[PDB]
Amino acid sequence: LLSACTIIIGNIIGSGIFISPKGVLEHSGSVGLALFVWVLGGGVTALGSLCYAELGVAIPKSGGDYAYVTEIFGGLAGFLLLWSAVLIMYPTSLAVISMTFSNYVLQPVFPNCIPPTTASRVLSMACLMLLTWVNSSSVRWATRIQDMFTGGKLLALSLIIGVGLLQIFQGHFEELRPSNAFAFWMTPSVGHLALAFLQGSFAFSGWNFLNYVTEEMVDARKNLPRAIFISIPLVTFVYTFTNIAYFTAMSPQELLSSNAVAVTFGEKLLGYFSWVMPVSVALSTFGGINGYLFTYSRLCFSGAREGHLPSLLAMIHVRHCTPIPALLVCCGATAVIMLVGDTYTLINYVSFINYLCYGVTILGLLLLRWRRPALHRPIKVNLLIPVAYLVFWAFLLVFSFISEPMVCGVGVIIILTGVPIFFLGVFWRSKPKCVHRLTESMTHWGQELCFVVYPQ
Amino acid sequence: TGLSKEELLKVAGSPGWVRTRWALLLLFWLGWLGMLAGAVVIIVRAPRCRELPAQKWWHTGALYRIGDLQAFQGHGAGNLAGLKGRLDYLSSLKVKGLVLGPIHKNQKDDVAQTDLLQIDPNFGSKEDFDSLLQSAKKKSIRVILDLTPNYRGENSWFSTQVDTVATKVKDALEFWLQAGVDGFQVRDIENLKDASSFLAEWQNITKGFSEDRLLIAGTNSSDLQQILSLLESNKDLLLTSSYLSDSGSTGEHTKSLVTQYLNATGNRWCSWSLSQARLLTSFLPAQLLRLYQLMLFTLPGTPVFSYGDEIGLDAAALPGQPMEAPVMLWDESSFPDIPGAVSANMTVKGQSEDPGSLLSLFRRLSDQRSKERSLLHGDFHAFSAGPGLFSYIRHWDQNERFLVVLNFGDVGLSAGLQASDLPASASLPAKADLLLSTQPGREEGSPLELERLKLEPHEGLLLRFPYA
Ligand SMILES: *[C@@H]1O[C@H](CO)[C@@H](O)[C@H](O)[C@H]1NC(C)=O
Ligand SMILES: *[C@@H]1O[C@H](CO)[C@@H](O)[C@H](O)[C@H]1NC(C)=O
Ligand SMILES: *[C@@H]1O[C@H](CO)[C@@H](O)[C@H](O)[C@H]1NC(C)=O
Ligand SMILES: *[C@@H]1O[C@H](CO)[C@@H](O)[C@H](O)[C@H]1NC(C)=O
Helix, strand or coil: CHHHHHHHHHHHCCCCCCCHHHHHHHHHCCHHHHHHHHHHHHHHHHHHHHHHHHHHHHCCCCCCHHHHHHHHCCHHHHHHHHHHHHHHHHHHHHHHHHHHHHHHHHCCCCCCCCCCHHHHHHHHHHHHHHHHHHHHHCCHHHHHHHHHHHHHHHHHHHHHHHHHHHHHHHCCCCCCCHHHHCCCCCCCCHHHHHHHHHHHCCCCCCHHHHHHHCCCCCCHHHHHHHHHHHHHHHHHHHHHHHHHHHHHHCCHHHHHCCCCHHHHHHHHHHCHHHHHHHHHHHHHHHHHHHHHHHHHHHHHHHHHHHCCCCHHHCCEECCCCCCHHHHHHHHHHHHHHHCCCCHHHHHHHHHHHHHHHHHHHHHHHHHHHHHCCCCCCCCCCCCHHHHHHHHHHHHHHHHHHHHCHHHHHHHHHHHHCHHHHHHHHCCCCCCCHHHHHHHHHHHHHHHHHHCEECCC | CCCCCHHHHHHHCCCCHHHHHHHHHHHHHHHHHHHHHHHHHHHHCCCCCCCCCCCCCCCCCCEEECCCHHHHHCCCCCCHHHHHHHHHHHHHHCCCEEEECCCEECCCCCCCCCEEEEECHHHCCHHHHHHHHHHHHHCCCEEEEECCCCCCCCCCCCCCCCHHHHHHHHHHHHHHHHHCCCEEEEECCCCCCCHHHHHHHHHHHHHHHCCCCEEEEEECCCCHHHHHHHHCCCCCCEEEEHHHCCCCCCHHHHHHHHHHHHHHHCCCCCCCCCCCCCCHHHCCCHHHHHHHHHHHHHCCCCCEECCCCCCCCCCCCCCCCCCCCCCCCCCCCCCCCCCCCCCCCCCCCCCCCCCCCHHHHHHHHHHHHHHCHHHHHCEEECCCCCCCEEEEEEECCCCCEEEEEEECCCCCEECCCCCCCCCHHHCCCCEECCCEECCCCCCCCCCEECCCCEECCCCEEEEEECCC
């Protein structure tokens, strides 16, 4: 139970608390509203995780949202979700993490003036290529470095919490007083709260990945809900304490005008020893990238296992047993998206599509409950939780389209474009000799280029 | 499905494909190494940040002189304890200081009786002053005392010998820095003989106690020579003088006055004010107040305003108010002597909820001066203007730039902005936003062209454009 709890905490926690605070503050307009947004997100993710756990214990099949949606709706929705996974959340998430790594590295060099875009983008791409090569090299090395990355991230968070506790003990709580905590510098419209929630929900991303590994624990039914109860509120409290430490370290404008919150925190509170901690945050970003690559490869394996994706994306190396074609494809995709925009827009985009997919799957769970009430479900949840999730999801989506329409519209366009390709790929089963010949030629070319074989 | 067998692939990839992988692996590794080298090369050859100047406390906002406490609150509340309730109002104005007083005991023209170490009981007791400091300190409103030896008499420094006066000032200083004041002000130094030596001594003592204590001097001279003759020995002295007292309603003349004064002193810190203990309205008409207030905040320096200036309060336009200490109008009942003689436009209460009121202009301007890096310590560059225009750029390193155009004339003109008078890093753009205008009828936040712009008579525009 405790080991599973640590698994949930490790999967949920990540380099999101190093990107969120500026975006949350810029929309909330006050410290108290930002903290309320944080705690509300920490509760809503708990609710969604509980409902997802109920869905996962209902269907012992593994594969996450992909498998669950393929089970309830069918092939079309499952392939649409897989398309959204391979195209949006994994590449945008990798690009965001790399960009924040570059920002955090270059901020001490240029403390006041923004670093050049070319250098930051080049550094991010170099880090990404290094990570892709490292993951392609081996697996035991990769997991060892991932474990030490997790150690570095937990060390950074522990030091931040300790410094915050030391500062609050000595009596620096000027901003936390209700006179200054609720000092609104701008009236927040409903869209501003929605965008702040979207920005702040990036830190919790990855809480779905426990369903991706549902087939590798013993007695999931007993430990899993208790695992959520112990883990997620602890994560919310940790994020709350980190935000409190940041706010005791700085002031609203003193924090918003910063490209990297943690490095300025170290340089203004820790003192001469500040140089150590940006390395820690960079190591945390390294770990996030490595974990995302692992989840990517596993997702591609699951996707090509069913057969909507071409079989070339699940083949392993003959010697090292690694799926290099998928890694190269994703590296290209994220390198493409990175040289387009900024961290803020990408975060909004990926969080919106995250919530859209979560709502789609939760609606699928509700449809399964309505259609099929007679199957044995080890755990049962009261309908208030799903109806609350549905109403919050609806309100959030309408607010997202109303306030900032471009990113949600383009995301909807890209996911909808996955329907005709699905119809021409899977629903169209009488492919002529030309299409089959091209497919097999590409298959053989991939085999001879990558030296990979189908897993046994 | 279709795929190549493991044994089949091993046979196929043996003869010549192995060389291809090694070449591709070496090529990809070489590209990564050069890619990292390029970033470091770009980083090394990148422009570096400019150091911050470590501003003191009298740099990030105006000062709010208070000539007389009796007229600031009115009858029945002329006490330091009553003033303690006003600090919420002052913090709304976001002033960074109050030139309070003077409050030392001085009956009439008596050097022996005049004691600068004892607070007159009429204004309150010492405990009230101490309580005032803590409330002000908690609200970050640094209190500056006034130490003019004679304020109830015709001569501010007595007709007798002044050596004993100097000792009294020094004794008052060491005592009052012990109390906890954050500066001092001496007015009417014209009547002080050889005042340069005393100012150097007092500034030496004031800076000796701490590096965050300032001395403010005030004289009524209006020419550049005696002002420089007083600032030749001392360089960290804020001097408020009637240098801009004459208006002339001519933008070119004001442009000359500001530019020459800065050029003569180099680029040292200055204080912009129209007098030492007088309001704006004593030298300007009603339509120019919204114009000067934009000029004083945007110029490089620490604006110094008298009490009742945010509302444009005037004593000559309302009978019963002495010109020296007009009574501040807090509400419709703030002047019970002549009921019905006051309006809602002349009181602070009636202007707090009006976006177009004079006080609203003060509050938004004071906000911009107190936070933006360009207005705080940015370089001030003034280029060629129109026949009666006055314009300048407030730029600082990579931060957002500011442009202000003032039309002191009464005839509508055009911008006529001329290039080749700014540094390469401060070149004007084709399009620039619009922050605020002195008069209603303009669209705020709308990017506006900088070549076909036209000026309404008696209008000042504040525009912002980021780095180009
Ligand atoms: C100012 O104080 C310093 C410190 O003792 C002293 O050396 C200097 O002579 C003083 N200057 C004047 C003009 O009193
Ligand atoms: C300035 O003060 C001097 C000294 O008495 C006086 O002669 C002169 O008239 C004053 N000027 C103004 C404009 O107050
Ligand atoms: C400042 O004055 C000097 C001496 O007259 C002159 O050479 C210089 O051009 C002036 N600078 C400005 C900016 O007016
Ligand atoms: C306020 O109204 C009075 C009464 O008509 C008028 O005299 C005064 O000029 C007005 N003030 C402003 C700023 O318009």
